[PDB]
Amino acid sequence: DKPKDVSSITIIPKPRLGFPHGKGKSDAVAMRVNPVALTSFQDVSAYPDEPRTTL
Amino acid sequence: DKPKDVSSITIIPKPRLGFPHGKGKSDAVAMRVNPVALTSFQDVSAYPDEPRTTLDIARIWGLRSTFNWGSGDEHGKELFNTVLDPGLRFYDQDYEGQITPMEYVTGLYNFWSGPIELRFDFVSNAFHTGTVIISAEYNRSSTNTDECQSHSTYTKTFHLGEQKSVHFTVPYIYDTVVRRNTASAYLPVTDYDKVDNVSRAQAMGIRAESKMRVKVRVVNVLRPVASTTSTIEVLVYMRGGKNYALHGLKQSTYWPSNSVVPIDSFPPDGYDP
Amino acid sequence: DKPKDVSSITIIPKPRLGFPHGKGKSDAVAMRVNPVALTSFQDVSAYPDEPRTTLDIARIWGLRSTFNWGSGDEHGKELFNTVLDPGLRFYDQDYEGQITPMEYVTGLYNFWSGPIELRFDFVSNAFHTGTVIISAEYNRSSTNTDECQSHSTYTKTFHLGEQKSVHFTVPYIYDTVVRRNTASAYLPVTDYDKVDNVSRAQAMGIRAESKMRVKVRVVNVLRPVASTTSTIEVLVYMRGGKNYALHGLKQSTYWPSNSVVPIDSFPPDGYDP
Amino acid sequence: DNPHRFLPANVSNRWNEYSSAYLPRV
Amino acid sequence: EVPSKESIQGDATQQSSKEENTIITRDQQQTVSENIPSTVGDLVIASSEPTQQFRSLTNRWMPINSIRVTVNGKRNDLLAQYYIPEDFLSTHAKCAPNTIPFETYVYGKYELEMKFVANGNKFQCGKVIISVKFDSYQADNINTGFQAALSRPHIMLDLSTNNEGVLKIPFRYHRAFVRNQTHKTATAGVRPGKFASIYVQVLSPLQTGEGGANDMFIRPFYRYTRAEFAGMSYKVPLT
Amino acid sequence: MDTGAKEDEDETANFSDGVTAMGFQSLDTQVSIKDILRRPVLLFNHVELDPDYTGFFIPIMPPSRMMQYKSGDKETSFQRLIGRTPQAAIMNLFRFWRGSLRYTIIIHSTDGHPIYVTHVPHTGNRVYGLMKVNNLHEYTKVPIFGCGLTTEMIIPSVNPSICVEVPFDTENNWAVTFDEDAQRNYSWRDKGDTVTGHLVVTPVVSVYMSVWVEAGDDFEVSNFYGPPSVKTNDWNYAFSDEH
Amino acid sequence: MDTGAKEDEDETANFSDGVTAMGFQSLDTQVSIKDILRRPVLLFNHVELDPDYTGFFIPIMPPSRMMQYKSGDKETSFQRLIGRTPQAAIMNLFRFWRGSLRYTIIIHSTDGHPIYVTHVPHTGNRVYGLMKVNNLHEYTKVPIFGCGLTTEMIIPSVNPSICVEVPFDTENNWAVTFDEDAQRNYSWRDKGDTVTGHLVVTPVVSVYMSVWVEAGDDFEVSNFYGPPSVKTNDWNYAFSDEH
Ligand SMILES: [Ca+2]
Ligand SMILES: [Ca+2]
Ligand SMILES: [Ca+2]
Ligand SMILES: [Ca+2]
Structure with missing residues (x-):
């Protein structure tokens, strides 16, 4: 069968996702084999005595 | 209130939905008052005895x-000898006539497979008698005068008499699970263009001609009584x-x-005499 | 009824889905009748003994x-001495020949790590006898005439006799968890362009040449009986x-x-003799 | 013409591939 | 695996292989390649009719041509090479009963085993490698060095220890069956009788001592462990 | 459909029926007649739309011998390979069809002008191409898309293509697929029973369009006619694998 | 594949096997052969499509030595680095492959003209580039995309790119990856076993396109051949870290 699909939605186009923000979401595409793999901080990570905020 | 909506998604734009497919989804818009109403097949519908697939046909x-x-x-004589390729009846000449349903439908596909069935109906009467041997020959073929080479394959010997018909299933024995059609997948020629080798070198493919044959040879010479026809179809x-x-x-x-x-356009194109 | 639909979402348009990735999602459209049908691997499939990863290879x-x-x-003589870099066999000359499977596959990556295994097969017989010492040397190397400098590293002394083969695991000891390949990540040169320093200054990277070496030195001079070959490979x-x-x-x-x-195109490009 | 089209007769079999009898190919 | 002290007949600790009406003994150890699978599932579809086996004829050991190894052989040199089943039908051991079924069936699936027996003496030395390349038609001249041989299913022979080697060859082809014979009436569009190649190559040159022999010999033996035939036809002479 | 098995009275032994190869290479089975008829067939390849006409008419009928090109006959705006598509070949075996058809229309443009597609139910005629309804000389003041009939619009700058499904708006139980002679002048009410209406495309400015057709989801064929006399000369246009 | 472990009979002591570094920097493991073959390879970089031809043919076959550029040989429309991509290097080790391939086609345009991509199943030939099928001089009346074969369309004004997955429509169990000599004239049916069909791109007006290929999800390789004779001259084109 080849039934018609009547689902639809109106959309508002924007060029970037979260461009001004320091947090939230990003639409960045990973230059990796696996789109969701990330850098590991299991062994090498920020030392606890390093400052975390400007305060 | 007029809260902001932060939901979003990245999208990939495409012009059509399901354009190449015969099933799945379609984004067709109905030219109806109700976008989801459909034609009714409650009373008028396809009759159950109509073919549903090309395999049925x-x-x-x-x-x-x-x-x-x-x-x-005489004994051993080939009464029938043909390459059994459902893709093309001839490899060296045009075909024109009433092609069989299975060949007609096979002509719509690039691949076919499975056994093929044959039925030989002798248009005779109870006074005709004789015996023939039907053989399916693969890869390598027999000489027209060497009946023994045909007898070495897949055979069915039929004793013609009171029964005037015999069924024969042709085995599918090839080095591939399916066979590719010998006809073309695309032929743009529409005006019987006189062909040359450049045209052929630029065809859609290369015809993989079959060597598989089915032959019928005389085993016991037909011996009808003098009162009836001495030759039957x-x-x-x-x-x-x-x-x-x-x-x-x-x-x-x-x-x-x-x-x-x-x-043409009716009635605009001169239907008004 | 024809109620208005107020649902909406903001979208970010992109031309392709998963273009750079080797896994994840794809927006590929199937050139099939059924958009979701796939090739069957029920009967014909990859044999279990075929390599599945480049590490297998x-x-x-x-x-x-x-x-x-x-x-x-003579004793102490280097019979074998090489920089053990799976990235390049030579740093000063072209390579042509049958590269090993591990080097072939390492040539597809910019980084490698872990121990490397070596196996020395002495093409001899039971009448050849002698002893060699295999050493893995890091950072700093030994003089060709100073066997003691080689003896101060990671060594395995092999007593050649009835057994004609010895395995040696080369430790991975470097100041980085992985090592970067000495070959290039991108080389656009295709016509053996005579190189100059401007070409090199504009290469894709800088070759971090390895100083790690594996050497094999004579411990006890080979002493085969006169009746057999005095030199073995x-x-x-x-x-x-x-x-x-x-x-x-x-x-x-x-x-x-x-x-x-x-x-070239077959048969269009002159295959028809 | 194209030298790749046909293998010389002395190194090939009737199928235009190296003959299994021709050991020097390597 | 373990030798014994000498007695009247020396160190009597040989092993042997008996397949059908053929036996082959070995004086030392033997190296064997892995037992690997062939494609299964296409047989019942490519052939509407039942396929056949004739084990008593095909599963026996048959020696083929003798191989000479000399001190002049260089690494990578081809000592011998076989296009199978073709070369076992029309060039080597042609009168072998193992070839009988190929005279009447046009198609087949073949799984073989090849045993190699060498005889170099205790003052010689050298290494030979035998490997198989599946579906090699028109790809024999690439991936054909000792390196590719060491990567594909192979066996190694030491010329002074005389260990035996057994290469197990499954049926891996791009079609369901391989064609058994060429024929004046058969198509020329498909080269038949070849689903694989076997190469015997020098890994390390044979060497000998002062006044020693400048050569030694190796003998290959084959047997089908599984030969299935399809498509009966009249019998024909092989190639 | 009558298989003819009724005439096969032989009951002697036969060779095996084997095992089907369907699904061995893949699960994409392509033998369902409806599946085949649901894939698009090109009718018009880059034809012109002229605003001086009411619009370009597309008769609602599936592909068949009714649109087959014959070497030597007058040139029409129909693409020449329609008669050899698998779906036309199938339709040439069934003289009845009921249900909707889907038309994919592409306007070769990126302008912001709306192009309208208007549906006309079964009215008795069967025409195609540009036509001036009632032979007037201006249609922008009396547009067919503004008369009350169901109409849809295409705006090329948003999407130059559209897929519309036309209903089975006719008085008959079934639509008649084909005639032996598409140009014979016979009883006029019967003449129009091979279509279920028309689709009319009207532009603002001159522009080109392409049209494809396929069966809808609510669609059935019947009245199997058996195969017609056919011809083929494929053999002559290719080499065999033996040179 | 035979590891050769069978020939390593030494059982004396060795140094440690250590701990793997895989996953230490990140979890993006890149050693899976199928993962590697699923990332795109550029075949044609900005090549021309001419409407005077049936279309531009793309033989369905993965990247390998069959497309390798050799300094000095005739210029083809294939990009010159295909033979050195990781996936071509992998394919040069496997002579069998089965399954689908995915082609990413980009039309350098923003026009509203539809560009069609037609799939041709295995027919026996192996061609690439612009071709006039059966050497005719006009194809708009007999378009390959309107003959019945599976076809998809690209409309640049909406999206100049598309990704199509072609099936494994062939009679063989496996497709043959490569030959020792891609130009040798040998048994014709065998010659065509290195492809599973073609993809044909047909435009309305002259325009350029780029093509990438990758393995589909339903894809397998086999018949490991071991490594071939190779060469490298990388060393000569860069400085070492010691000047
Ligand atoms: Ca029966
Ligand atoms: Ca049965
Ligand atoms: Ca240990
Ligand atoms: Ca340890």
Whole structure:
């Protein structure tokens, strides 16, 4: 069968996702084999005595 | 309140939905008052005895060929000999006539497979008597004068008498699970262009001609009584076996050759005499 | 009724889905009747003994080099001495030949790590006798005439006799968790362009040449009986250790050097003799 | 013409591939 | 695996292989390649009719041509090479009963085993490698060195220890069956009788001592462990 | 459909029926007649739309011999390979069809002008191409898309293509697929029973369009006619694998 | 594949096997052969499509030595680095492949003209580039995309790119990856076993396109051949870290 699909939605186009923000979401595409793999901080990570905020 | 909506998603734009497919989804918009109403098949619908698949059609017996058998045909003589390729009846000449249902439908695909069924109907009476041997020969073929080479294959010997018909299932024995059609997948020639080798070198493919043959040879010379005809016609029917398969839709190898007139505008195009 | 639909979402348009990735999602449209049907691997499928990863391939023993050992080679003499860099066999000359499986596959990555395995096969017989010492030297190297400097590293002394082969695991000891390949990540040169320093200054990177070496020195001079050959060949095999790792896909450093002919159109390009 | 089309007769079999009898190919 | 002290007949600790009406003994150890699978599932579809086996004829050991190894052989040199089943039908051991079924069936699936027996003496030395390349038609001249051999299913022979080697060859072809014979009436569009190649190559040159022999010999033996035939036809002479 | 099995009275032994190869290479089975008829067929390849006409008419009928090109006959705006498509070949076996058809229309443009597609139910005629309804000389003041009939619009700058499904708006139980002679002048009410209406495309400015057709989801064929006389000359246009 | 472990009979002591570094920097492991073959390879970089031809043919076959450029040989429309991509290097080790391939086609345009991509199943030939099928001189009346074969369309004004997955429509169990000589004239049916069909791109007006290929999800390789003879001259084109 080849039934018609009547689902639809109106959309508002924007060029970037979260461009001004320091947090939230990003639409960045990973230059990796696996789109969701990330850098590991299991062994090498920020030392606890390093400052975390400007305060 | 007028809260901001932060939901979003990245999208990939495409012009059509399901354009190449025969099933799945369609984004068709109905030219109806109700976008989801459909045609009713509650009362008027396809009759259950109509074919539903091309394989159903391939299962319809069709008259493929005919040949004569006379009291003058000596033992071992080939009464029938043909390459059994459902893709093309001839590799060296045009075909025009009433192609069988299975060949017609096979002409829509690039691949076929499975056993093929044959039925030999002897148009005789109870006073005709004789014996023939039907053989399916693969890869390598027999000499027209060497009956023994035919007898070494897949054979069925039929004792013609009170019964005037015999069924024969042609085994599918090849080095590939399916066979590719010998006809073309696309032929843009429409005006019977006189062909040359450049045209052929630039065809859609290369014809993988079959060497598989089915032959019928005389075992016991036909010996009808003097009072009846000394030569009878034998009808050869053909159709796909129950496990016949088809795949790879392509340009139809066969096309209507009789009473073909394209439509014109009615009544604008001079229908008003 | 024809109620308004107030649902909406903001979208970010992109031309392709998963273009750079080797896994994840794809927006590919199937050229099939059924948009979700797939190729069947029920009967025809990859054999279980075929390699599944590049690390599997790196675990195949390959003949790396060969060297001779004769009764004339005095104690301490280097019979074999090489920089053990799976990235490049030479830093000063072209390479042409049958590269080992592990080097071939390492040539597809910008980083490698883990122990490397070597196997020395002495092509001798029970009448050859002698002793050699294999050493893995890091950071700083030994003088060709100072056997003691080699003896101060990671060593394995092999007593050649009835057994004609010895395995050696080369430790991975570096100041980084992985090492970067010495070959290039991208080389656009295709016509053996005579190189100059401007070309080099504008290369894709800077070759971090390795100083790590593996040497084989004579401990006890080979003393075969007079009736047999006084010099034997030693085959040096190499492959990645069980914890060998590879990362950073790049342009392959190696390419076919034998019988390379690009395809042409068949049969259009003059196949019709 | 194209030298790749046909293998010289002395190194090939009737199928235009190296003969299994021709050991020097390597 | 373990030798014994000498007695009247020396160190009597040989092992042997008996297949049908053929036996082959070995004086030392033997190296064997892995037992690997062939494609299964296409047989019942490519052939509507039942396929056949004739084990008593095909599963016996048959020696083929003798191989000479000399001190002049260089690494990578081809000592011998076989296109199978073709070369076992029309060039080597042509009168072998193992070839009988190929005279009447046009198609087949074949799984073989090849045993190699060498005889170099205790003052000689050298290494030979035998490997198989599946579906090699028109690809024999690439991936054909000792390196490719060491990567594909192979066996290694040491010329002074005389260990035996057994290469197990499954049926891996791009079609369901391989064609058994060429024929004046058969198509020329498909080269038949070849689903694989076997190469015997020098890994390390044979060497000998002062006044020693400058050569030694190796003998290959084959047997089908599984030969299935399809498509009966009249019998024909092989190639 | 009558298989003819009724005439096969032989009951002697036969060779095996084997095992089907369907699904061995893949699960994409392509033998369902409806599946085949649901894939698009090109009718018009880059034809012109002229605003001086009411619009370009598309008769609602599936592909068949009714649109087959014959070497030597007058040139029409129909693409020449329609008669050899698998779906036309199938339709040439069934003289009845009921249900909707889907038309994919592409306007070769990126302008912001709306192009309208208007549906006309079964009215008795059967025409195609540009036509001036009632032979007037201006249609922008009396547009067919503004008369009350169901109409849809295409705006090329948003999407130059559209897929519309036309209903089975006719008085008959079934639509007649084909005639032996598409140009014979016979009883006029019967003449128009091979279509279920028309689709009319009207532009603002001159522009080109392409049209494809396929069966809708609510669609059935029947009245199997058996195969017609056919021809083929494929063999002559290719080499065999033996040179 | 035979590891050769069978020939390593030494059982004396060795140094440690250590701990793997895989996953230490990140979890993006790149050693899976199928993962590697699923990332795109550029075949044609900005090549021309001419409407005077049937279309531009793309033989369905993965990247390998069959497309390798050799300094000095005739210029083809294939990009010159295909033979050194990781996936071509992998394919040069496997002579069998089965399954689908995915083609990413980009039309350098923003026009509203539809560009069609037609799939041709295995027919026996192996061609690439612009071709006039059967050597005719006009194809708009007999378009390959309107003959019945599976076809998809690209409309640049909406999206100049598309990704199509072609099936494994062939009679063989496996497709043959490569030959020792891609130009040798040998048994014709065998010659065509290195492809599973073609993809044909047909424009309305002259325009350029780029093509990438990758393995589909339903894809397998086999018949490991071991490594071939190779070469490299990388060393000569860069400085070392010691000047
Ligand atoms: Ca029965
Ligand atoms: Ca049975
Ligand atoms: Ca240990
Ligand atoms: Ca340890």
